[PDB]
Design a binder for these strands. Structure first.
Ligand SMILES: [Mg+2]
Ligand SMILES: [Mg+2]
Ligand SMILES: [Mg+2]
Ligand SMILES: [Mg+2]
Ligand SMILES: [Mg+2]
Ligand SMILES: [Mg+2]
Ligand SMILES: [Mg+2]
Ligand SMILES: [Mg+2]
Ligand SMILES: [Mg+2]
Ligand SMILES: [Mg+2]
Ligand SMILES: [Mg+2]
Ligand SMILES: [Mg+2]
Ligand SMILES: [Mg+2]
Ligand SMILES: [Mg+2]
Ligand SMILES: [Mg+2]
Ligand SMILES: [Mg+2]
Ligand SMILES: [Mg+2]
Ligand SMILES: [Mg+2]
Ligand SMILES: [Mg+2]
Ligand SMILES: [Mg+2]
Ligand SMILES: [Mg+2]
Ligand SMILES: [Mg+2]
Ligand SMILES: [Mg+2]
Ligand SMILES: [Mg+2]
Ligand SMILES: [Mg+2]
Ligand SMILES: [Mg+2]
Ligand SMILES: [Mg+2]
Ligand SMILES: [Mg+2]
Length: 206
RNA sequence: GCCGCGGUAAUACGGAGGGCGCGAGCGUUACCCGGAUUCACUGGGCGUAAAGGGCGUGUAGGCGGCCUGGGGCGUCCCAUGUGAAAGACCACGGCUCAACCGUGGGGGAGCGUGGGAUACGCUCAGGCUAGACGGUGGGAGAGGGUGGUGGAAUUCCCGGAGUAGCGGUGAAAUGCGCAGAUACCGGGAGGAACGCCGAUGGCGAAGGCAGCCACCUGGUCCACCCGUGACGCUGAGGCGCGAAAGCGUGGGGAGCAAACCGGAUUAGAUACCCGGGUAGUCCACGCCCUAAACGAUGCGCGCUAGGUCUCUGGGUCUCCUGGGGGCCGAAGCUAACGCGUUAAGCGCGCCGCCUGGGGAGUACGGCCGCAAGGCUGAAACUCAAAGGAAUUGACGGGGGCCCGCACAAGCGGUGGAGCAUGUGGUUUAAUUCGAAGCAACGCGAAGAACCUUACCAGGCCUUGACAUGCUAGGGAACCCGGGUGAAAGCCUGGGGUGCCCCGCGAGGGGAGCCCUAGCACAGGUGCUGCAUGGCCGUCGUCAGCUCGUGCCGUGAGGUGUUGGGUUAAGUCCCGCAACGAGCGCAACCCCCGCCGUUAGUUGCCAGCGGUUCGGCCGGGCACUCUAACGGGACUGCCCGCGAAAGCGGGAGGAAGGAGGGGACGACGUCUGGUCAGCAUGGCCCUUACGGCCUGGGCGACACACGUGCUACAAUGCCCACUACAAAGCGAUGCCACCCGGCAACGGGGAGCUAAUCGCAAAAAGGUGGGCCCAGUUCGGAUUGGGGUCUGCAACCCGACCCCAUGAAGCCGGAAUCGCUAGUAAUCGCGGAUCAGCCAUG
C-alpha cells in the first residue's frame, strides 16, 4: 500500500476540483451530498457514451453540470430529446433548477478514465488482459502524449492466484508535482471476482 | 509409459457432449530389433562428470625409419567351378484384385582351381644412418646405501648460586615447588631431529630425498661428432619397489603421543581446552602394500605463435642453441573451469580402464597375510536420479568500504505505586468481532449509560426495518382516539377519498397507493481477505530496480548499474565496450527566515489638537499585523587543497552550501492488514446466522503486560498581586455584564452569522508572604455525606462542585525507550468526535 493519488496530490497545481463552488457551515454537506447524487445518475446512464469527468459549479439555486463525453451524441440524443429527460430527471432529484452542458472529448484516447474503461470492458469481454493493456498503452503512446502506463488487478484470466499486469511507455513521473498526469480507475466485475484497472497518462508539462 | 494429475475454477480422477485415431477390429500384456553414437567396426570415452592401472623391470603379443633387388603370403584384378530349392529383388503371367501361386531373368559374400599385377603390409638378401645404444670430454644434484663427526635445543642426574612460587588458561584447576621447584652458571648421560642456506630451487620411476665428511653405487644433461647399424616404442601374466599406520623377534626410548588417568568448559561431554601416559614414533632383520600413492591428467614419438621469470651444460656469452621447472598466451581444444610446444591441440603405436545412483568394494568363490587385512568382485533389491561447470540470488560465528540516536557521549523516562487506557488469563447467560515480534496491545473505535452494538436473556415481526416486479381479492391516500404491554408488538374504534375515461344515475372499469394470502425476492457485521478490487503497513525517504541499442558468452546471463573520487543520494566527476533512457534521487509545491509591490474599518502621540487617557473620537497609512504576487544564495564571489567533482576557510548578507520542517514513500517483499468502511467471486442461513424492542453486556479480579497521567517535594508546594502566545472554535452555538450560591451552576441578559464581539485567565514566569523536611500546607487514591448539570434515564457505568477520609508512594530488580536544537525536558492553550463523557488519548 503506497503511491498517493496522483490527482489529489496535484489538486493545488496542474489539476483542479470536479466540484468548484463555495458555501459552507450549514450547507456544504447538504450541497456536497447533492453532487454525489447527480454523479450518481450521470454515471449509471451516460456510460455507453464515455463519461470522463463531471464538473459541477454553483451560484445559488443555479448549478452548472458539464458532462465530459467522447460520444456527445449519445448524451444528447435524437435531435436532443434525451438531454431533455436527463436534464429533467436531474430536477426530480434536485429542485435547484440547473442546466447541463456536454463537452466532447478531444481524442478519448487521451482521457485516463476512458483509456481505462476501454481496458475494463475488454476484460469483462474475456479478452487477454496482457493484450488490452499493451494495446491501450500503445494507443495513448501512439496518439500524442509523452507517457502512459496501465495497471490491472489480479485474477487476470480467472487465475486462482491474484496477479498484476504492467506495460508502460515514455515518461510517467508521479513524484513530480508539476508533471500534470491524468489518472483514472476502472473497476471490472466478472464471473470470477473483481478486477481494478488503473491508467495514468502524462501530458506535456504545465 | 516418463514427467506427473487430485487437498472445494482440475483441459491429467468419473459421467456427459464434443473431437482425433483406427475400423472388424481396437486396446492391453509379454518378448526381439529400433530410437540407444547407451558396448561406439561403421560411431564414444577417462583433469574436475563413471573411467589411467602407486611406480618400474620385462615375457607372450601388437606396432616399426631409409635405399635396391628376389618371393609375391597378405592385398588387388580376370577367368571358371561352387554358391540346389523356397524366400528376397525384377519382368511377365494365372485365381474378377490382392494376398497366394506359376514362368523367365539378375545379383551374391565366401570358398576351390588357373592366370595376372606388385604400390602398400609379410618374408628374404644386400646397403645407409636421420631412431636407438656405445665412446671422448666435460656439469648440476636433499638420488641411494655404508661408516663417522658436528653444533642448537629438550628432558633427566651431579655441583654452585638463589628463593616462593612455577607452570598453564578465554578464565581456571589438576600438576610441579621449602626432601627448596621455576629462573641463572658450570659439568655429565641419553635419544631424536638438523636451524640460517632454503627458494617462487634441486634430484628420483613412484614412494620419496636436505648439518658435514669419506667411501661404495644408480640415473641424467651437454659438447664432439668418433664407434655399432634399426639393434626400436608399448607391454596381458609374471617379478621387484612402494608414505603413514599396523604386525613379528630384539634393542633403544629425549621429545611427542592412540588407548587410558585426572583437571576444566557443557543442559550432558566417554570431545574441542589443560596436566600426566602406554602402544607408537627410533634402529635391525622379517611381514604388511594401502593412500586425496593427485599433476585426481599411462608411455614413446613427430608436428603447431610468442612473450616472461627461473635452475642446469654449450656457446662467436646479459644474445643465440640443448635439457628441467613456473608464469602469461597464438591457433586449436573444452560442457565450462580451463589446457595450450612441462597440451587437456594435431597425429601414430601399445597398454590400463569406464559403460547411472544406492546396495558394494559389500556377499560368495578363489589367491595372498602371523594377524589387521589385501587384490579379484557380483546380484536380489531400489531410486529417477546420482553427477560435473558455470549464472543469479540468499546466507556465513568470511573479508574490505559505508550509512541510520543503531552503539557510545549525554539529558530525561519506562520497569516499582495510585490511577487512566489497551491487551491477555481468570470469568461470565454475554463479557460481539478484529489487530499479535519490529511492521498488535489509548490499534479500527475522533467518544459503549440508551442508541451505537455486531454478544446475552426475555417479549415480539415475517415480503419483513429496506429495492424493482407478478397473480387472486376487499378496500384503497392519509389523519385522530382505546385496550394488554417494559417496549415492541398483538387486538381494535371512527372521521375520509377525491384523479382520468364511459354512464341520466345507482353503479361499473381503471392509474399512484394500503392490507390479507401465495410467489420472484429483500436482508445477513454468517465463513472465506491463502478467491479479489480498494485503500494502508513494512524493508525504506533506504538508494536503489530496470529498459533500448551495441559488445562479451553455446547458454543461464554479464557489461552499462563495476572501478578511483565526491555526494544526503546510481548526486556529480574521471575512468571503462559501451552509448543512452526510464522508475527512483533532486527540482517543481506548502509553512517558517530578510525584503518589495499591492491593499489598509489591524495597527500607532510613531508626527499633530480634543479625552470620560480604555487609541476612545478627528486623521493618517508610516510601523505591526493581515493575504496575495514578486525579488532573494548559485559554493556566484575571494583565498587554498584537487585532474575534475567536491571539500576546508573567509567576505557581503535575513539566510550558505540541500537555511529548518512538511508534502512527496521506486521495481518489488511478506500467501503482511482489512471480506466489520466500502466493493465483489464462491459457500452457507432465509418461523430464520433476517428485523424491532426493554434490560443487560462490551466497564467485574485476587492476577500479568503494553501505552500513558499524577506523584514521591523545597532548582518545592500553598495564597495574594501582577506580565508577555500561537493556533483553532462558535445560530438550532460561543456567551461578556449583574445579582444568587463556598462552589459546580441557576435566573436575568448585551454583542457576534464573527482580524475590528465571545469562549480566555495562557501556564511556567515575576512580586510579597507562608510552610521548614516531617509522610509532613509533599501525594492525591479510596470512602462516607451533601449538591449541580447533561440526558427520557446517570444502580450496574458519567462529569463536575463542596466537606470529610486522605491510602500506595521517600524517585524504582533483571531488563528496557526517546531525543543531536529551538530539539530533549518542561509549561499551558486549541480542535475533531461530542447531549454529556470516563481525553491523563
Ligand atoms: Mg547400437
Ligand atoms: Mg559416453
Ligand atoms: Mg617397413
Ligand atoms: Mg599370393
Ligand atoms: Mg537358391
Ligand atoms: Mg636390413
Ligand atoms: Mg655418478
Ligand atoms: Mg617398458
Ligand atoms: Mg613404519
Ligand atoms: Mg615393531
Ligand atoms: Mg616416562
Ligand atoms: Mg573421477
Ligand atoms: Mg659452441
Ligand atoms: Mg622448457
Ligand atoms: Mg594459459
Ligand atoms: Mg583463442
Ligand atoms: Mg578396501
Ligand atoms: Mg572370502
Ligand atoms: Mg566427486
Ligand atoms: Mg557443483
Ligand atoms: Mg537524527
Ligand atoms: Mg546510550
Ligand atoms: Mg508501573
Ligand atoms: Mg552537498
Ligand atoms: Mg536521501
Ligand atoms: Mg521528492
Ligand atoms: Mg495472512
Ligand atoms: Mg472495549
Amino acid at each position: 500500500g503506497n503511491k498517493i493519488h496522483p490527482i489529489g496530490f496535484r489538486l493545488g497545481i496542474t489539476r483542479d476540483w470536479e466540484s468548484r463552488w463555495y458555501a459552507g457551515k450549514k450547507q456544504y454537506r447538504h450541497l456536497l451530498l447533492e453532487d454525489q447524487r447527480i454523479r450518481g445518475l450521470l454515471e449509471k446512464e451516460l456510460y455507453s457514451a464515455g463519461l470522463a469527468r463531471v464538473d459541477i459549479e454553483r451560484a445559488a439555486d443555479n448549478v452548472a453540470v458539464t458532462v465530459h463525453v467522447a460520444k456527445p451524441g449519445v448524451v444528447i440524443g435524437r435531435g436532443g430529446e434525451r438531454i431533455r429527460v436527463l436534464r429533467e430527471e436531474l430536477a426530480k432529484l434536485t429542485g435547484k433548477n440547473v442546466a447541463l452542458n456536454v463537452q466532447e472529448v478531444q481524442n478519448p484516447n487521451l482521457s485516463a478514465p476512458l483509456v481505462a474503461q476501454r481496458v475494463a470492458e475488454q476484460i469483462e469481454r474475456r479478452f487477454a488482459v496482457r493484450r488490452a493493456i499493451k494495446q491501450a498503452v500503445q494507443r495513448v503512446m501512439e496518439s500524442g502524449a509523452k507517457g502512459a502506463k496501465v495497471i490491472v488487478s489480479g485474477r487476470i484470466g480467472g487465475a486462482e492466484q491474484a496477479r498484476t499486469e504492467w506495460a508502460a511507455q515514455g515518461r510517467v513521473p508521479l513524484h513530480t508535482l508539476r508533471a500534470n498526469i491524468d489518472y483514472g480507475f476502472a473497476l471490472a466485475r466478472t464471473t470470477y471476482g473483481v478486477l481494478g484497472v488503473k491508467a495514468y497518462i502524462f501530458l506535456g508539462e504545465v
